[PDB]
Design an enzyme around this catalytic site. Structure first.
Site, PDB file in Angstrom:
ATOM      1  N   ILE A   1       0.787  -1.182   0.050  1.00  0.00           N
ATOM      2  CA  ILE A   1      -0.220   0.213   0.263  1.00  0.00           C
ATOM      3  C   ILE A   1       0.819   1.518  -0.136  1.00  0.00           C
ATOM      4  O   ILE A   1       0.408   2.275  -0.850  1.00  0.00           O
ATOM      5  CB  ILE A   1      -1.072   0.118   1.320  1.00  0.00           C
ATOM      6  CG1 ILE A   1      -1.994  -1.108   0.852  1.00  0.00           C
ATOM      7  CG2 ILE A   1      -1.605   1.443   1.450  1.00  0.00           C
ATOM      8  CD1 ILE A   1      -3.122  -1.075   1.907  1.00  0.00           C
TER       9      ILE A   1
ATOM     10  N   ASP B   1       6.154  -2.016   6.725  1.00  0.00           N
ATOM     11  CA  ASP B   1       5.214  -1.684   5.650  1.00  0.00           C
ATOM     12  C   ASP B   1       3.692  -1.843   5.851  1.00  0.00           C
ATOM     13  O   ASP B   1       3.597  -2.700   6.816  1.00  0.00           O
ATOM     14  CB  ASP B   1       5.779  -2.625   4.381  1.00  0.00           C
ATOM     15  CG  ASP B   1       6.882  -2.245   3.900  1.00  0.00           C
ATOM     16  OD1 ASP B   1       7.516  -1.200   3.517  1.00  0.00           O
ATOM     17  OD2 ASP B   1       8.167  -3.709   4.153  1.00  0.00           O
TER      18      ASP B   1
ATOM     19  N   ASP C   1       0.335  12.939  17.954  1.00  0.00           N
ATOM     20  CA  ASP C   1       0.771  13.045  16.764  1.00  0.00           C
ATOM     21  C   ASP C   1      -0.365  13.832  15.892  1.00  0.00           C
ATOM     22  O   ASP C   1      -0.637  13.037  14.699  1.00  0.00           O
ATOM     23  CB  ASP C   1       1.267  12.113  16.263  1.00  0.00           C
ATOM     24  CG  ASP C   1       2.233  12.089  15.224  1.00  0.00           C
ATOM     25  OD1 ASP C   1       2.697  13.164  14.814  1.00  0.00           O
ATOM     26  OD2 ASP C   1       2.511  11.225  14.179  1.00  0.00           O
TER      27      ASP C   1
HETATM   28  N1  LIG Z   1      -5.672   0.814   8.332  1.00  0.00           N
HETATM   29  C1  LIG Z   1      -5.265   1.386   7.234  1.00  0.00           C
HETATM   30  N2  LIG Z   1      -6.064   0.914   5.914  1.00  0.00           N
HETATM   31  C2  LIG Z   1      -5.346   1.357   4.886  1.00  0.00           C
HETATM   32  N3  LIG Z   1      -4.342   2.400   4.848  1.00  0.00           N
HETATM   33  C3  LIG Z   1      -3.818   2.697   5.783  1.00  0.00           C
HETATM   34  C4  LIG Z   1      -4.094   2.152   7.050  1.00  0.00           C
HETATM   35  N4  LIG Z   1      -3.302   2.750   7.764  1.00  0.00           N
HETATM   36  C5  LIG Z   1      -2.493   3.585   7.355  1.00  0.00           C
HETATM   37  N5  LIG Z   1      -2.666   3.708   5.903  1.00  0.00           N
HETATM   38  C6  LIG Z   1      -2.098   4.225   4.833  1.00  0.00           C
HETATM   39  O1  LIG Z   1      -1.063   3.589   4.161  1.00  0.00           O
HETATM   40  C7  LIG Z   1      -0.003   4.343   3.565  1.00  0.00           C
HETATM   41  C8  LIG Z   1       1.324   4.119   4.236  1.00  0.00           C
HETATM   42  O2  LIG Z   1       1.266   4.502   5.774  1.00  0.00           O
HETATM   43  P1  LIG Z   1       2.407   4.667   6.763  1.00  0.00           P
HETATM   44  O3  LIG Z   1       3.642   3.932   6.010  1.00  0.00           O
HETATM   45  O4  LIG Z   1       2.167   3.648   7.915  1.00  0.00           O
HETATM   46  O5  LIG Z   1       2.563   6.037   7.077  1.00  0.00           O
HETATM   47  P2  LIG Z   1       3.834   6.871   6.643  1.00  0.00           P
HETATM   48  O6  LIG Z   1       4.078   6.524   5.169  1.00  0.00           O
HETATM   49  O7  LIG Z   1       3.375   8.283   7.122  1.00  0.00           O
HETATM   50  O8  LIG Z   1       5.069   6.759   7.641  1.00  0.00           O
HETATM   51  C9  LIG Z   1      -0.410   5.942   4.156  1.00  0.00           C
HETATM   52  O9  LIG Z   1      -1.167   6.531   3.119  1.00  0.00           O
HETATM   53  C10 LIG Z   1      -1.674   5.511   5.105  1.00  0.00           C
HETATM   54  O10 LIG Z   1      -2.713   6.517   4.910  1.00  0.00           O
END
Ligand SMILES: Nc1ncnc2c1ncn2[C@@H]1O[C@H](COP(=O)(O)OP(=O)(O)O)[C@@H](O)[C@H]1O
Length: 357
Positions: free
Chosen positions: A14, A21, A127
């Protein structure tokens, strides 16, 4: 494509991040699409286990993603949780980085409730920022959810409600664009600070930016302190120029809260509920992106293309789309703002006719 927690299959990414990840996942028994987060067990600063435990403690709250499973799978810490939709920062970009008063008010009402629930479970988020609020997928696309509890903290004892003690010289960690003045000053964060951060987001959404964005410095501390100086030295009036008085009232309230003090969440919700009444908005879950997306679909039956879609959307939904005018120096009256309804209708072939259908 490996398995997690017996029945969850990992799918496409994603996806990536600093603490690991995030993947699409599937429940092999029910077919339900979920989200799966992975963290290497060799990580130097493990955070997933902590977050999963917070998520578990918060389980059952409205707008809190519901954790299904967490634990160990080979070389990975894993967490299975509700699949969610776009973040508010994602949707901000889709709307070309400005939200209507109506959409900001509606987000604010939901977000105050989310923060209230989290505090009611003895945690502070710490945050609060647009990236950490996501809409649901599908029919849940009208519900604001809160994510990212890695920096969250217990602010009071579960049984006695004894507040954590006041403390100073605390360090600051992330982008401090939405950080409270007291966080900048190194004060132990408490409930007030979550709400102040929420306040900056609302002003951000309305005006399109905050006045301490895009700064550069020689060191992290210098940058933080330049942001602090602007937050401190720019008046709430100036900060909230062009916004109805509720927005500066919201900010003054948060800045005036004492360290261990319980916020009056209902008073804050009433700010924006009262404002939506004065502005003749319905709390109908019709967000800017909802209506722009609908309008576009009908039209199609890039900066310049958006502007045409937005023009039609603002004509069809004239009473919904009112915007801050950043040249304003004052707090506009409700009647002042509602004048945009007339302006929206007065804008201009077959295309105007197509959309009504
Ligand atoms: N439960 C979830 N379902 C779908 N997408 C999510 C969920 N939690 C986070 N995301 C999305 O996945 C992507 C990657 O998130 P993450 O890597 O954890 O945050 P960041 O990239 O800011 O460190 C972000 O666009 C976030 O919006």
């Amino acid at each position: 494509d490996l398995r997690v927690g017996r029945k969850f299959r990992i799918g496409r990414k994603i996806g990536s991040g600093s603490f690991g990840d995030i993947y699409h996942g599937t429940n092999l028994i029910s077919g339900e699409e979920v989200a799966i987060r992975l963290e290497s067990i060799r990580s130097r600063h493990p955070q997933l286990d902590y977050e999963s435990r917070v998520y578990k403690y918060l389980s059952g709250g409205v707008g809190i993603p519901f954790i299904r499973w967490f634990g160990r799978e080979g070389e990975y810490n894993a967490m299975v949780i509700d699949l969610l939709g776009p973040s508010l920062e994602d949707l901000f970009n889709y709307c070309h980085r400005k939200f209507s008063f109506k959409t900001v008010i509606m987000l604010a009402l939901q977000m105050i409730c989310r923060v209230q629930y989290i505090h009611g479970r003895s945690f502070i988020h710490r945050d609060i920022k647009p990236d950490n609020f996501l809409m649901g997928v599908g029919r849940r696309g009208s519900t604001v959810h809160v994510i990212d509890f890695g920096l969250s903290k217990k602010y009071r004892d579960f049984n006695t409600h004894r507040h954590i003690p006041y403390r100073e010289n605390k360090s600051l960690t992330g982008t401090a664009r939405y950080a409270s003045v007291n966080t900048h000053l190194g004060i132990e964060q408490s409930r007030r600070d979550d709400l102040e951060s929420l306040g900056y987001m609302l002003i951000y959404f309305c005006k399109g930016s905050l006045p301490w964005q895009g700064l550069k410095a020689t060191t992290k501390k210098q940058k933080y302190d330049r942001i602090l100086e602007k937050k401190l030295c720019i008046s709430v009036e100036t900060l909230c120029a062009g916004l109805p008085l509720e927005f500066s009232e919201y900010m003054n309230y948060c800045r005036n809260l004492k360290f261990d003090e319980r916020p009056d969440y209902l008073y804050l919700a009433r700010l924006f509920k009262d404002l939506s009444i004065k502005l003749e908005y319905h709390n109908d879950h019709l967000f800017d992106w909802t209506m722009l997306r609908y309008t576009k679909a009908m039209v199609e039956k890039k900066n310049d293309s958006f502007n045409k879609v937005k023009l039609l959307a603002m004509k069809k939904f004239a009473s919904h789309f009112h915007y801050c005018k950043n040249d304003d120096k004052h707090y506009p009256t409700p009647e002042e703002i509602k004048q945009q309804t007339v302006q929206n209708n007065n804008a201009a072939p077959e295309l105007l006719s197509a959309i009504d259908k």
